[PDB]
Amino acid sequence: MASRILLNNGAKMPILGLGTWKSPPGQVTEAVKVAIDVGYRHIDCAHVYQNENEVGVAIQEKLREQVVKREELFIVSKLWCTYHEKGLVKGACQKTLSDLKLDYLDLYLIHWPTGFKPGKEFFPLDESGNVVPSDTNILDTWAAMEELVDEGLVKAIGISNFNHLQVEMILNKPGLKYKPAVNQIECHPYLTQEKLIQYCQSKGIVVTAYSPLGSPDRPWAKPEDPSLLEDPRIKAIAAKHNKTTAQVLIRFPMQRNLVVIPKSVTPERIAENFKVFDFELSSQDMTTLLSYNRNWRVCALLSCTSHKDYPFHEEF
Template identity: 40%
Template sequence: MTDRAPALKLNNNREMPIIGLGTFMAASEVIEPMVDAALEAGYRFIDTGYWHCNEEAIGSALNKWLRSGRITREELFIATKMPSTANRAELVEESLKKSLEALQLSYIDMYILHFPFGYEYLDLQQRLCVVDNTTDIVSIWKAMEQQVEAGRTLSIGLASFNARQLKRIVKAARIPPAVLMIELNVYLQQKELVGFCKALDVAVCAYAPLGSPDLPLLMKMMGFDSESIPALNALSDPVVLSIAEKHSKTASQVLLRHIVQRGIAAVPKSMHPSRIKENFQVFDFELDDDDMDRLYVLDKGRRARMYNTSIFPE
């Protein structure tokens, strides 16, 4: 087993590993080998969510490791997210308890408010989404603070919030958000929002850090309109490949190294054990200033956003 990943110090003095395992849309039947490969490689951060539909499978895989004595609960950093159909203050505690039961844990390390809006009704198969215009993110946040005080979660954070929404939470909070999870990769570097978070002492964690090149096909297969999702693949970008060759590394390792050198955490997803291991091997080399500058130039801004209105029309 390799060494563990370096950690980011959070604003509540807890630590979050800078590389974690993403599990978005990973079917339950592939979760156990994914978690096994990740923990064997040295990962200690597992990211999931109610809508990932795999909390129970992750809980079973973790429980196997914990019962075997190969790992302790204190070594793990488990994050999950609240369903937006429960984006109401009175449903926060119930939602977290359901996730804890599914994960077979007495507490989690990070509970995340998944979106700054809630749904009155959601049917993914029929693509029916009705936004709840009464969503009150401040009252939801106050209910999440109560979960910290009750010991059900050690930290609380946000996902997919913009700067204005983040500022609203920080201004009203007794317990400030420890993390903001956002779509971030070499084509969508989010420099302004990252700078804003750092000024507020909120850590940033990148989802889709490799750019999700398969997302358009996946969305098309699910029946979504995928025409406006950019057809981009940073893994085959000539600049990325040139830097990878220079360091005898893979494109994915260069992309992840670029993020962690910015002081940002990342949760790459792969269902292949060899790639899961590869994505963790980014701590034995360093990009020089020229490498970083060449990668910074690849930023395409909002034009590179993959998780856009094709998926969230509201």
């Protein structure tokens, strides 16, 4: 299958990218180096992951080694929640650009719909544990994102963790300048996202699937949470194809016309995870994997459930 998907800005986005959340700076430079060597051309970043400097060190090295040119790369980052005020957006983007040593991003996302109180702390809480919101709204933050395209800092803008009504809010904004190009959402066999994918695709919004392996390294995991990589049913599908469970989990979203961004810092796994363009999951495989949906979320904070823009009260 084709390695890139067409966005609404006329640019092509690689359908397989490298995730970088929880890649420590002490290891992410080597990860990105290896990824580029083995063919990754999309890297998913964020300011909150606090490793964009080291990601940037890799891109620059590989540019200087003559391994890749900038136009071939597709670099994504995201505006953190403490920067939703219209006056903070450009500076947040420019900090990401400076850390990554880039002059533009291919795609810049509103990381979460929830604005948090501005300040140094990424998750400001009150005395008992709820996040402290900011008096920001989706539409004004979107307008600020649009300005970044009009100044040449970013080629495309999109959203992440937006429910369909939040997406609709942007689509229906009077005076909209740019439609979101992408909605990046959690998606895997335990959270198959049928209704939100159908919605987004029916708008020409491309969907990126995050945590496709179930984020086993997420820092809030409980031993009794369900584990995709160890699910014997998925292992059986992998065995039949002489592939790993991770390779099945990466191929799955690709066959749904999604982009997918598995994370690893392990060189062997980085290479493994890219070797998914040479087999196909059957109709039965696809149906079986979709049947495993449990509406189970890696990423959803309790602490954000009272925010006016918390995305996950809506069904989709």
